[PDB]
Ligand binder design. Structure first.
Ligand SMILES: Nc1ncnc2c1ncn2[C@@H]1O[C@H](COP(=O)(O)CP(=O)(O)OP(=O)(O)O)[C@@H](O)[C@H]1O
Ligand SMILES: Nc1ncnc2c1ncn2[C@@H]1O[C@H](COP(=O)(O)CP(=O)(O)OP(=O)(O)O)[C@@H](O)[C@H]1O
Lengths: 284, 286
């Protein structure tokens, strides 16, 4: 097998390659003076199953993935398999107003045209998997998150909204903990929040889990609500830590700690999903 | 017909739309907090021939084109026709080393998959045309450049290297002028230049023409050479004025004026290709 490690995913891809006892093949990569992207893979990938590892979220990341898909065509490879730890544009998986792109659709179509398989970790909404002509697998960071928190004192696992439920139910089951979610709504400028079930959080230690942290607004608000109700400790976890200015400070206003995975590498990437990806590769 | 004017081509697209008595339809466009691109075309495009005008060279331009090609699928259109006044990645039209992308190939395949036709103005190397499943037309700024310089005192039209020869031959003939080209080559750290034919440029007014000005090294050097040999005026034109790294100033050290087209809009964009694109649009109909 050959593991290609793209710029966005050097850390995770390296962890993966080492575990698999194989080279993390990186491109030679630079920008031409006019700003166009240049890539080169001088290693002979002929006859190998190739696993390209890189996020598909920024303009640059998309260009890096597309041009990689072209570069590898120089070789008669056994198969080409895309693994995008964080899959970009998953949030635009339908048209929400007329004349909008279904961004995740056209992009998945493109990737699927040039590969034999696609996989990502905890895609936002699985609708997008249906846009691929090749098998598109949704991998899960659950076990890695459970591994981390087995050595932490936790009373409840909590979803910040009424949508992150399945993940929180699975994670809590594996930790042997109870769980609940927070339903937040705005009714005429004023905010209303319901705990379901209506758990007493007074003096309790809470692990809040979500899939993505962007602006952090969603998790920051719920953390503040729970702190207000007497939570003794709040841990914040997400799979994909984007942390756009200035999410970390909003969250840490009321939460004690932030721990995300290495799908998107940051100072808070304390939980690696390498094992989950290796399983997929081993079986693919 | 509906003309869609993308961010990179607002000036040219607007000129085209106005010439054709139609709206230059712009997207509502913005970046989400995480940096992902949002576009929206609220106009009803159903039943129309659509012409999407935008360059395809920057990362953002590529995303703009791709997401536009998805957004317009919300409507039952008659046809979708891409016009990229400047076509990105045309310079990488083969693998020059093992394991390089053929960037112009994969990108052309993508655009072709979501359109009924593609056009650009003066592609760098027509090899890339063959990468498209749909008809990929190479329009030319020649007549526009001619129309500008028929009112300029010019003695010779000149190619900066021995490759943009057909264009310079066509332009000089339409101006009723002679032409030559400069062969520059490096031989053991020294640079050797030959004029072909070996024209005496002393006291002569020269129009240098290329397809793209990027770093402008070749043109700046040639201008210096020609100036040293006694040229009285040097005009520099190119279809695509990218102007990276101070190139325009490097060139103006020895050239008198720079005039480029509006394929890439800058303060040097004095020659519009709107008529050439309108003629193409008229042919494809609507
Ligand atoms: N990268 C991004 N960042 C922020 N918002 C985005 C985004 N991409 C798309 N969006 C917007 O986010 C909104 C998502 O719609 P919502 O109704 O809030 C959730 P949904 O997509 O219906 O269900 P889901 O979140 O369970 O998949 C849309 O308006 C979409 O345009
Ligand atoms: N945007 C860009 N800017 C600068 N150089 C680029 C580029 N994209 C690709 N290149 C490089 O430019 C080189 C072009 O190859 P050359 O041998 O100089 C001319 P050619 O492409 O063979 O003929 P042509 O210029 O007549 O098309 C390649 O090494 C390619 O990798």
């Amino acid at each position: 097998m050959k593991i290609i490690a793209l710029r966005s995913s050097l850390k995770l891809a390296a962890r993966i390659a080492e575990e698999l006892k194989t080279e993390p093949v990186m491109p030679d990569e630079r920008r031409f003076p006019d700003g166009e992207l240049y890539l080169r893979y001088d290693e002979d990938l002929t006859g190998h199953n190739i696993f390209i590892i890189g996020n598909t979220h920024s303009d640059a990341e998309v260009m890096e993935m597309i041009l990689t898909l072209s570069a590898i065509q120089d070789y008669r490879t056994k198969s080409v398999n895309i693994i995008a730890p964080y899959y970009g544009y998953a949030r635009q998986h339908q048209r929400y107003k007329n004349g909008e792109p279904i961004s995740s659709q056209i992009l998945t179509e493109i990737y699927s045209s040039y590969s034999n398989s696609i996989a990502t970790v905890d895609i936002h909404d699985e609708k997008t998997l249906s846009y691929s002509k090749v098998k598109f697998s949704d991998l899960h960071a659950n076990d890695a998150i459970v591994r981390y928190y087995k050595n932490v004192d936790v009373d409840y696992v909590v979803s910040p909204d009424d949508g992150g439920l399945a993940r929180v139910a699975d994670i809590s089951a594996k930790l042997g903990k109870k769980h609940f979610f927070i339903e937040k709504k705005r009714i005429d400028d004023r905010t209303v929040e319901m705990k379901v079930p209506n758990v007493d959080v007074n003096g309790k230690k809470l692990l809040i889990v979500d899939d993505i942290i962007s602006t952090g607004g969603t998790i920051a608000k719920s953390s503040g609500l729970l702190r207000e109700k007497g939570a003794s400790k709040i841990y914040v976890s997400a799979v994909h830590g984007l942390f756009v200015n200035g999410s970390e400070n909003k969250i840490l206003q009321n939460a004690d700690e932030i721990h995300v995975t290495d799908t998107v590498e940051s100072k808070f990437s304390d939980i690696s999903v390498y094992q989950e990806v290796c399983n997929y590769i081993r079986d693919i």
